[PDB]
């Protein structure tokens, strides 16, 4: 951790001198609330058949998408106050902040 620097590191290491890894790449996310897993620490809700969540059966993500999200693409309402650039800048910006890897 150098005493004086003019530029950012590529990895973000050393931006916070007190906690050098804060903001750096390939490190766990911070948590604003504790995790809620089916077994308390790893299994996700909807993993075990029959296991309710907070007293109610877990809805299938695709069923929620089907009954709440699905709409006729003929009926699309265009945002009269924003351009498609507003959308694209969001995805570009999202790709500066976070990427959650999975295995292969």
């Amino acid at each position: 951790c150098p005493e004086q620097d003019k530029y950012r590191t590529i990895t973000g290491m050393c931006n916070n001198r007190r906690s050098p890894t804060l903001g750096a790449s390939n490190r766990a996310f911070v948590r604003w609330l504790p995790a809620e897993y089916e077994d308390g620490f790893s299994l996700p809700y909807g993993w075990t058949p029959g296991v309710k969540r907070n007293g109610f059966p877990v809805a299938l993500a695709r069923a929620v998408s089907n009954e709440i999200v699905r709409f006729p693409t003929d009926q699309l309402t265009p945002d009269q106050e924003r351009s498609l650039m507003f959308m694209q800048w969001g995805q570009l910006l999202d790709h500066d902040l976070d990427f959650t890897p999975e295995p292969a």
Binding site: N16, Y37, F41, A63, P78, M87, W89, G90, D94, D96
Partner: protein, 464 residues
């Protein structure tokens, strides 16, 4: 193997198919899903958490990379100019293009089976997911090499490492300025913007700059703004032949459309001149992402909104009412209570039908179900998550462009006159660009101006 199997065994967490599915009639099939890698693989002590592979900072890490070996491979090391690698095979009508990537099973080759067009290599591995993202990256690569070329004429005694970093620091600052001055006020609305992003006092080393786990799902609100087509325009902003209204399901991973169809110019024209999809409580997301996401590059098409909810479960994120409490917002219990919060009883009866309790509503579903804040595009819950995150990124960034020591008073006065339209002016053959705000301007020719009205960045304050 989650790519091909339906068995729920680690690390696979497939999405089961409901009865009478509109697209998937075979109930034995599934939507493929790999659980996010845990920070602490196979542990019975630690509560499972996921990894951010990138720098949380708004440091243009999607251009330079978040790891040292990728970062060096993105630069031109044959000379002392401080440039970043340009495709040694193709050019967008003379202008620079992203260099290709060496992949074992290249998905971009699967979009046009005869074009022999691989993926692009950039600071972030998702460069070729959509031509619109590729165009944004391609625009920033040229801007860095433009800055490193104008810095060489002002400071000839400077080296390659001195030109790369100084150009990096300009690009980064521009990403922060467009993001915070022009983007964020349009997402949160004026009231939440004032509440969550009060005017910058100075960098504070006690503010955690990490991305919170929930933000990775909450910022997916952008999925409601996604239009079902890629709009391409000509010189006079007219539908450009060929393929002026191409479906999104035919452009994911289709890097051949940039290399063989007009380059980034007709793609960038149309992000400016076409209006974004507006989120309505009865029109949450288009079926190009809800039914045909990555259709022609994998065994089955994906449902991005369903993946968003499965991902929130994978990440063990608390439900809707837990986040409402976290933000200081009221937590409804009954369908009548939910109907008042959402200002829509038709949607509350719908959410109750699936979840049973407002406590179980997945953070993404609940987030995008709220009415939009005035002059904003997110509800109160998402405005809090997104607002709080962006404030931590700003106040906890030691190299935040506005912080004392980062830039000279004169350099800051120069950086303030930057705009996304003027960056398009400099790095493309586009003669007529959007009138600021670029994110609001969506009508041609009402909201369009020429290059000569927008002044370029004067780097005089940078010479020695």
């Amino acid at each position: 193997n989650c790519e091909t199997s339906c068995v729920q065994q680690p690390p696979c967490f497939p999405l089961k198919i409901p009865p009478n599915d509109p697209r998937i009639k075979n109930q034995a099939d599934c939507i493929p899903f790999f659980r996010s890698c845990p920070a602490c693989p196979g542990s019975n002590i630690t509560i499972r958490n996921q990894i951010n592979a990138l720098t949380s900072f708004v440091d243009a890490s999607m251009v330079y990379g978040s790891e040292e070996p990728l970062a060096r491979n993105l630069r031109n090391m044959s000379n002392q100019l401080g440039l970043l690698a340009v495709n040694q095979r193709f050019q967008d009508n003379g202008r620079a293009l992203l260099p290709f990537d060496n992949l074992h099973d290249d998905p971009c080759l699967l979009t046009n089976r005869s074009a022999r067009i691989p993926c692009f290599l950039a600071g972030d591995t998702r460069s070729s997911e959509m031509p619109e993202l590729t165009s944004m990256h391609t625009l920033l690569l040229r801007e860095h090499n433009r800055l490193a070329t104008e810095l060489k004429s002002l400071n000839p005694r400077w080296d390659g490492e001195r030109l790369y970093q100084e150009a990096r620091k300009i690009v980064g600052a521009m990403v922060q300025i467009i993001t915070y001055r022009d983007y964020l006020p349009l997402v949160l609305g004026p009231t939440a913007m004032r509440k969550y992003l009060p005017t910058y006092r100075s960098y504070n080393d006690s503010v955690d700059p990490r991305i919170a786990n929930v933000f990775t799902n909450a910022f997916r609100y952008g999925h409601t703004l996604i239009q079902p087509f890629m709009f391409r325009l000509d010189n006079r902003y007219q539908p450009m032949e060929p393929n002026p209204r191409v479906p999104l399901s035919r452009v994911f991973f289709a890097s051949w459309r940039v290399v063989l169809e007009g380059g980034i110019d007709p793609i960038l024209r149309g992000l400016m001149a076409t209006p974004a999809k507006l989120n309505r409580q009865n029109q949450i997301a288009v079926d190009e992402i809800r039914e045909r996401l990555f259709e022609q590059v994998m065994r089955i098409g994906l449902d991005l909104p369903a993946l968003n909810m499965q991902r929130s479960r994978d990440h063990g994120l608390p439900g809707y009412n837990a986040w409402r409490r976290f933000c200081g917002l009221p937590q409804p219990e009954t369908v009548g209570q939910l109907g008042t919060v959402l200002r829509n009883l038709k949607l509350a009866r719908k959410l109750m039908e699936q979840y049973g309790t407002p406590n179980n509503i997945d953070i993404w579903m609940g987030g995008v179900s709220e009415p939009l804040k005035r002059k904003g595009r997110v509800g109160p819950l998402l405005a809090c998550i997104i607002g709080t995150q962006f404030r931590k990124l700003r106040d906890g960034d030691r190299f935040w462009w506005e912080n004392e020591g980062v830039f000279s008073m004169q350099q800051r006065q120069a950086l303030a006159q930057i705009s996304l339209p003027r960056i398009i002016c400099d790095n493309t053959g586009i003669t007529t660009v959007s009138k600021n705000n670029i994110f609001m301007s969506n009508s041609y020719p009402r909201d369009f101006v020429n290059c000569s009205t927008l002044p370029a960045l004067n780097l005089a304050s940078w010479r020695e």
